[PDB]
Amino acid sequence: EVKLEESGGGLVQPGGSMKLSCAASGFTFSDAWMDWVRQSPEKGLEWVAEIGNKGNNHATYYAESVKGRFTVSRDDSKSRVYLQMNSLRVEDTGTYYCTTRFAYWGQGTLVTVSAASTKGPSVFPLAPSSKSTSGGTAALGCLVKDYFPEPVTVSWNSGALTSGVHTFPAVLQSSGLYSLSSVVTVPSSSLGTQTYICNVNHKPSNTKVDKRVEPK
Amino acid sequence: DIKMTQSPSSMYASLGERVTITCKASQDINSYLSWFQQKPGKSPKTLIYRANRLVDGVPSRFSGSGSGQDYSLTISSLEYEDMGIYYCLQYDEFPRTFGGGTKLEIKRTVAAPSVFIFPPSDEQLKSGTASVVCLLNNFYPREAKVQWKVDNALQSGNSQESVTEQDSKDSTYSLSSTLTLSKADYEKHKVYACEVTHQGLSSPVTKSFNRGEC
Ligand SMILES: CC(=O)N[C@@H]1[C@@H](O[C@@H]2O[C@H](CO)[C@H](O)[C@H](O[C@]3(C(=O)O)C[C@H](O)[C@@H](NC(C)=O)[C@H]([C@H](O)[C@H](O)CO)O3)[C@H]2O)[C@H](O[C@@H]2O[C@@H](C)[C@@H](O)[C@@H](O)[C@@H]2O)[C@@H](CO)O[C@H]1O
Ligand code: NA
Question: Side by side, which strands form the sheet with A207-212?
Answer: A153-156, A197-202, A207-212
Q: How far is CA B58 from the centre of its chain?
A: 23
A2 touching B (Cβ < 8 Å): no
Strands (E), chain A: 3-7, 11-12, 18-25, 34-40, 44-51, 60-62, 70-75, 80-85, 94-100, 104-105, 109-113, 122-126, 137-147, 153-156, 165-167, 171-172, 178-187, 197-202, 207-212
Q: With b meaning 16 or more CB within 10 Å and e meaning fewer, what string describes B182-191?
A: eeeebeeeee
Looking up residue A16, the CATH number of its domain turns out to be 2.60.40.10
* Consecutive H or E run containing B95: none
DSSP state of A206: T
- Which ligand is in closest contact with the Cα of B53? 1
Domain identity same for A23 and A75: yes
Domain identity same for A37 and A96: yes
Nearest to B81 by CA among B159, B208, B169, B191: B169
Give me the half-sphere count of Cα atoms (radius 13 Å) on the Cβ side of residue B111.
19
Whether the Cβ atoms of residue B143 and residue B198 lie closer than 8 Å to each other: yes
Beta bridge partners of B116: B135
Domain identity same for A104 and A166: no
Residue extents of the structural domains in chain B: 4-107, 116-210
Give me the half-sphere count of Cα atoms (radius 13 Å) on the Cβ side of residue A168.
31
Q: With b meaning 16 or more CB within 10 Å and e meaning fewer, what string describes B23-60?
A: bbbeeebebbbbbbbbbeeebbbbbbbebbeebeebee
DSSP states of B26-77: SS--TT-EEEEEE-TTS--EEEEETTTEEPTT--TTEEEEEETTEEEEEESS
> Strands B159-163 and B173-182: what pairing?
antiparallel
Residue type, B104: L
A63 touching B (Cβ < 8 Å): yes
Whether the Cβ atoms of residue A205 and residue A118 lie closer than 8 Å to each other: yes
Domain identity same for A73 and A144: no
Omega before A187 within 30 of 0, i.e. cis: no
Instruction: Name the domain count of chain A.
Output: 2
The total of other beta-carbon atoms located within 10 Å of residue A153's CB is: 12
* Integer Cα distance of B124 and B74 in angstroms: 51
* Integer Cα distance of B149 and B193 in angstroms: 5
Domain identity same for A153 and A91: no
Angle at A169 between CA B103 and CA B152, to 5 degrees: 110
To one decimal, the resolution in angstroms is: 1.5
CA dihedral B146, B39, B168, A136 (to 10 degrees): -40
* Integer Cα distance of A35 and B68 in angstroms: 24
The total of other beta-carbon atoms located within 10 Å of residue A41's CB is: 7
Question: Side by side, which strands form the sheet with B173-182?
Answer: B114-118, B129-139, B173-182, B159-163
How close does chain A come to B13, measured CA to CA in Å? 23
DSSP state of A161: B
Residue type, B2: I
Whether the Cβ atoms of residue B4 and residue B90 lie closer than 8 Å to each other: yes
DSSP states of A13-62: -TT--EEEEEEEESS-GGG--EEEEEEETTTEEEEEEEE--GGGTT-EEE
Q: If you count them, how many residues does chain B have?
A: 214
* Integer Cα distance of A43 and B44 in angstroms: 15
- Which ligand is in closest contact with the Cα of B31? 1
Q: How far is CA B157 from the centre of its chain?
A: 23
Nearest to B63 by CA among B104, B20, B29: B20
Q: Residue B32 CA: which ligand 1 atom is closest?
A: 19
Domain identity same for A99 and A18: yes
For residue B89, give the nearest of A64, A102, A129 by CB distance. A102
Nearest to B15 by CA among B86, B133, B109: B109
- Which ligand is in closest contact with the Cα of B50? 1
Nearest to B43 by CA among B84, B89, B75: B84
If phi > 0 it is left, if psi is from -120 to 50 it is alpha, else beta; for residue B130 that is beta
* Integer Cα distance of B137 and A164 in angstroms: 10
Nearest to A96 by CA among A7, A194, A27: A7
* Integer Cα distance of A163 and A42 in angstroms: 33
Residue closest by Cα to atom 26 of ligand 1:
A103
* Integer Cα distance of B187 and A75 in angstroms: 61
Rg (CA), chain A: 21
Nearest to B79 by CA among B13, B20, B141, B142: B13
- Taking domain B4-107, whether its CATH number is 3.30.365.10 is answered by no
* Integer Cα distance of B29 and B11 in angstroms: 26
In this structure, what are the phi and psi dihedrals at residue B7, rounded to the nearest 5 degrees?
Answer: -145, 140
Give me the half-sphere count of Cα atoms (radius 13 Å) on the Cβ side of residue A56.
9
Write out residues with Cβ below 6 Å of ligand 1.
Answer: A 33, 52-53, 55-56, 101-103; B 32, 34, 49-50, 55, 91
Nearest to A211 by CA among A182, A189, A173: A182
In this structure, what are the phi and psi dihedrals at residue A35, rounded to the nearest 5 degrees?
Answer: -140, 150
Nearest to A192 by CA among A149, A146, A138, A150: A138
For residue B164, give the nearest of A127, A143, A168 by CB distance. A168
Q: What's the CA-to-centroid distance between A55 and ligand 1, angstroms?
A: 10
Cβ–Cβ below 8 Å for A126 and B114:
no
Q: How is domain B116-210 classified at the CATH fold level?
A: Immunoglobulin-like (2.60.40)
Domain identity same for A26 and A56: yes
The total of other beta-carbon atoms located within 10 Å of residue A35's CB is: 22
* Integer Cα distance of A36 and A24 in angstroms: 13
Give me the half-sphere count of Cα atoms (radius 13 Å) on the Cβ side of residue A73.
9
Domain extent at residue A62:
3-113
Whether the Cβ atoms of residue A176 and residue A90 lie closer than 8 Å to each other: no
DSSP states of B105-143: EEE---BPPEEEEEPPPHHHHTTTEEEEEEEEEEEBSS-
Is B161 exposed, middle or buried (CB count within 10 Å of its CB: 0-12, 13-18, 19+)? Answer: middle
Domain identity same for A105 and A9: yes
Beta bridge partners of A47: A37
Nearest to A32 by CA among A80, A83, A92, A101: A101
* Integer Cα distance of B68 and B70 in angstroms: 6
* Integer Cα distance of B186 and B132 in angstroms: 9
Is residue B9 helix, strand or coil?
coil
Count of pairs with CB atoms under 8 A, one residue in A, one in B: 115
Q: If you count them, how many residues does chain A have?
A: 216
Q: How far is CA A156 from the centre of its chain?
A: 18
> Strands A122-126 and A137-147: what pairing?
antiparallel
Whether the Cβ atoms of residue A2 and residue A27 lie closer than 8 Å to each other: yes
* Integer Cα distance of A124 and A145 in angstroms: 8
Method: X-ray
* Integer Cα distance of B169 and B188 in angstroms: 43
Domain identity same for A95 and A55: yes
* Integer Cα distance of B18 and A107 in angstroms: 30
Is residue A64 helix, strand or coil?
coil
Whether the Cβ atoms of residue B72 and residue B66 lie closer than 8 Å to each other: yes
Say yes or no: do domains B4-107 and B116-210 share a fold: yes
